[PDB]
């Protein structure tokens, strides 16, 4: 039997939110001048001149 009162449930959710997909779209990234780019040892990658 379908009992109307017994079948009532208060479904809860968040009122509203916005979902995002590409997080890195929010990141603007630049490089230092390649002449001054350094390696793991803190020295410039290329030093020939």
């Amino acid at each position: 039997q379908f009992d109307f009162r017994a079948s009532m449930h208060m479904l809860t959710s968040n009122l509203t939110f916005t979902v995002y997909s590409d997080l890195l779209a929010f990141v603007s990234a630049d490089t230092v001048e390649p002449i001054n780019a350094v390696a793991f040892d803190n020295m410039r990658i290329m030093n020939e001149l």
């Binding site: 779209a25 603007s28 990234a29 630049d30």
Partner: protein, 121 residues
């Protein structure tokens, strides 16, 4: 000089590094690099700003902004490939040459070869 001035003004509304500027006869092209990935709005804004900045100096320009290819008088690049127009006319000439019919037959064959290499057989 003109493109340097225009790019200087365009830097007002956008941050970019001018990678290269090339002035090839009947065309000019400059590559601008941004700190973000290029969007539709960025392309449209750069095109409009370039046009308006050129107009500020009374220069009428159709500033075409792309991310993948250009079209200039002596070539055009599409999809990472290069194309040359094969529009050399064979049975018509721009002006009367100072050569003989023999040399003009030689030039006709030369033009046919160049057109064939460029895709017009």
């Amino acid at each position: 000089a003109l493109i340097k001035t225009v790019l200087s003004r365009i830097s007002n509304k956008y941050s970019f590094a001018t990678k290269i500027i090339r002035v090839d006869g009947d065309d000019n092209y400059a590559v601008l690099q941004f700190n973000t990935e290029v969007t539709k709005q960025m392309v449209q804004d750069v095109s409009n700003d370039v046009r308006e900045t050129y107009a500020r100096m009374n220069t009428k320009v159709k500033a075409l902004v792309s991310t993948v290819g250009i079209e200039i008088a002596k070539r055009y690049i599409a999809g990472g490939k290069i194309f040359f127009r094969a529009g050399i006319n064979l049975l018509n000439n721009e002006k009367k040459g100072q050569s003989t019919q023999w040399d003009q037959a030689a030039v006709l064959y030369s033009n046919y070869i160049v057109n064939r290499l460029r895709g017009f057989e």
